[PDB]
Design a binder for these strands. Structure first.
Ligand SMILES: CC(C)N(CCCNC(=O)Nc1ccc(C(C)(C)C)cc1)C[C@H]1O[C@@H](n2ccc3c(N)ncnc32)[C@H](O)[C@@H]1O
Ligand SMILES: [K+]
Ligand SMILES: [K+]
Length: 550
DNA sequence: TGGGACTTTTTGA
DNA sequence: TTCAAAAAGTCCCA
């Protein structure tokens, strides 16, 4: 399956990571460094390590010959020494190890067979017999849906310090690498960036912060590093050195449309205008890692201090309907099959794209709220001609197999009363803040999140005021500071972060609310000349900036 | 083949 | 009993 050009780490990144770890190695003082890659594959990293080592030994061959055994340190012996004592690799694929072993053997190209330290094993189960000086590589990423159940139980029992709930497989590789790193060693890996902000990575970030000194983080944000692969990458470099001060070099990319396979070295790219550099004090990291420059930190801290309320304080949040099979329960509003379904069971259905700022597009789909169907004898045509077409798939849902749900019921139908009221809705993934007031009792899947204001905060906050500030440029920038960057121009808008947004009340409340009412009034007209909306938004942003003192 | 529009349901807790 | 998180996303066209 995984036999193609994908998953090959680009040469620029491989070269950077190998150099970053061995740039300043004192081969005279320690001529026996152990370099490990625990997901070496065909040896993208290890073959480069061999070359870097060979130059390093050959450049100091006469100093080694003089300080140590004169007969042992010769140029002809460098190849044997590297393979015996220096390069280590591990991979679960037997064929990959077979190829890597031949590649290392053919580096020199008789005598006694040289023992190459390659292991065909599960790196997370191996009883590692010693720690390592340097660890580099590109671990596998496997999410919570794509992991096997038996294997996941093992991770939960043994890697509980970093792996729980919706965590990822590469969380465990981070723990393994840190655990088998020598005092004073250096590790450098490329992994997905999502653990820097995700709720799942909370324990993993705590593990890294409390056990290694993070030297450098390269955040590519939504840039496409791996061709034809939908993943966002970062490079972490960490050590176990005794140092008094622990500051992190953060290199965050500025333009996501760059092509990495166009510059000579990654170092040239990082020092250029295509990246920004700033320092974060590792002691000042909380459970959240707020990796922003001084301007954005000052901006963020001003808003946090000024706002006395959060959305969670004043709102009730909930995820959308999860049918478990959308094609079985969602039909076009013009589908002739809806004449078989009583309007009592029909609900309006919108997708994330139907959410704009301040207002929702008119629904084009309907949801059959099948939970309200009492008996199978009644409304049999609905069960036999609409929902039953997917009966086999519906029966394969978890709650149907355990008997909690009937085969025709919605898997997670939530509570209708939550949806059939005035509320605010936003897409779960978007390029910008899009918070709308729903007036039409719209239902939606889990690609749209909703909340409504608690009764006790209705006098302080109105729906019109909230969509005003939340759709403002100030709050767009404020949310994206700590949001979870998913892919190019996509952020996660999930309650675990959206409900942490903080809000304020001051003298500008009335004028902000009135401007929001004007914007809503314009956006709902048939002859909508939606140009004045931009001007009103600009005026509102000025009031908000005045309110927060920025 | 790479870029852009859009986003299901499986899953642990 | 029933919540909400999770992109080695998914899909299509020029
Ligand atoms: C494929 C991705 C996921 N890979 C990224 C690193 C480069 N991998 C790579 O070049 N693989 C490869 C390339 C070509 C071949 C062919 C010979 C052409 C068939 C075979 C394998 C991760 C490697 O980790 C290995 N892996 C996965 C789980 C896991 C674990 N639990 N313990 C230890 N090693 C683990 C897996 O076999 C991969 O080689
Ligand atoms: K000597
Ligand atoms: K990406």
């Amino acid at each position: 399956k995984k036999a193609s050009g994908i998953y090959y780490t680009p040469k620029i990144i491989v070269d950077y990571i190998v150099k970053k770890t061995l740039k300043n190695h004192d081969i005279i003082k320690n001529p026996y460094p152990r370099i490990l890659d625990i997901s070496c594959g065909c040896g993208n990293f290890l073959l480069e390590v061999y070359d870097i080592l060979y130059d390093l030994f050959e450049e100091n061959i006469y100093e080694l010959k003089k300080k140590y055994d004169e007969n042992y340190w010769t140029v002809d012996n460098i190849h044997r020494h590297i393979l015996n004592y220096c390069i280590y690799g591990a991979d679960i694929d037997e064929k990959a190890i077979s190829i890597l072993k031949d590649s290392l053997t053919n580096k020199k190209v008789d005598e006694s067979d040289i023992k190459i330290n390659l292991f065909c094993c599960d790196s997370l189960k191996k009883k590692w017999r010693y720690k390592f000086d340097y660890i580099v590589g590109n671990p596998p990423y496997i999410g919570h849906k794509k992991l096997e159940k038996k294997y996941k139980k093992f991770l939960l029992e043994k890697y509980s310090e970093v792996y729980k709930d919706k965590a990822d497989l590469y969380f465990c590789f981070y723990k393994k690498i840190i655990d088998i790193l020598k005092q004073g060693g250096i590790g450098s890996v490329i992994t997905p960036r999502y653990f820097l902000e995700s709720l799942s990575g909370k324990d993993l970030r705590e593990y890294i912060k409390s056990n290694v000194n993070v030297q450098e983080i390269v955040d590519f944000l939504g840039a496409n590093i791996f061709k034809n692969i939908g993943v966002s990458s970062c490079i972490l470099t960490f050590d176990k050195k005794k140092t008094k001060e622990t500051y992190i070099d953060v290199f965050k990319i500025k333009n996501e449309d760059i092509c990495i396979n166009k510059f000579e070295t990654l170092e040239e790219l990082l020092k250029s205008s295509k990246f920004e550099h700033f320092n974060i004090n590792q002691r000042l990291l909380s459970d959240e890692w707020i990796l922003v420059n001084k301007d954005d930190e000052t901006f963020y801290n001003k808003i946090q201090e000024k706002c006395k309320y959060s959305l969670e304080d004043i709102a009730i949040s909930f995820q959308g309907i999860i049918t478990g099979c959308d094609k079985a329960f969602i039909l076009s509003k013009d589908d002739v099959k809806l004449n078989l379904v009583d309007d009592k069971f029909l609900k309006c259905w919108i997708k994330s794209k139907n959410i704009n700022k301040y207002i929702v597009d008119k629904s084009e789909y309907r949801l059959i709220y099948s939970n309200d169907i009492d008996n199978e004898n009644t409304n049999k045509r609905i069960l036999d001609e609409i929902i039953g077409l997917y009966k086999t798939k519906l029966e394969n849902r978890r709650e149907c197999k355990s008997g909690i749900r009937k085969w025709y019921e919605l898997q997670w139908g939530r509570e209708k009363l939550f949806f059939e009221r005035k509320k605010i809705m936003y897409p779960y993934k978007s390029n910008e803040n899009r918070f709308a007031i729903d007036y039409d009792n719209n239902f939606s899947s889990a690609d749209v999140y909703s909340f409504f204001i608690k009764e006790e905060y209705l006098d302080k906050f109105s729906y019109e005021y909230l969509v005003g500030i939340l759709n403002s440029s100030v709050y767009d920038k404020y949310f994206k500071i700590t949001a979870k960057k998913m892919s190019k121009n996509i952020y996660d808008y999930y309650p675990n972060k959206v409900m942490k947004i903080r809000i304020f009340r001051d003298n500008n409340y009335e004028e902000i609310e009135n401007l929001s009412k004007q914007i809503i009034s314009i956006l709902l007209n048939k002859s909508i000349d939606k140009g004045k909306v931009e001007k009103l938004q600009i005026k509102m942003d000025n009031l908000i900036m005045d309110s927060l003192g920025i």
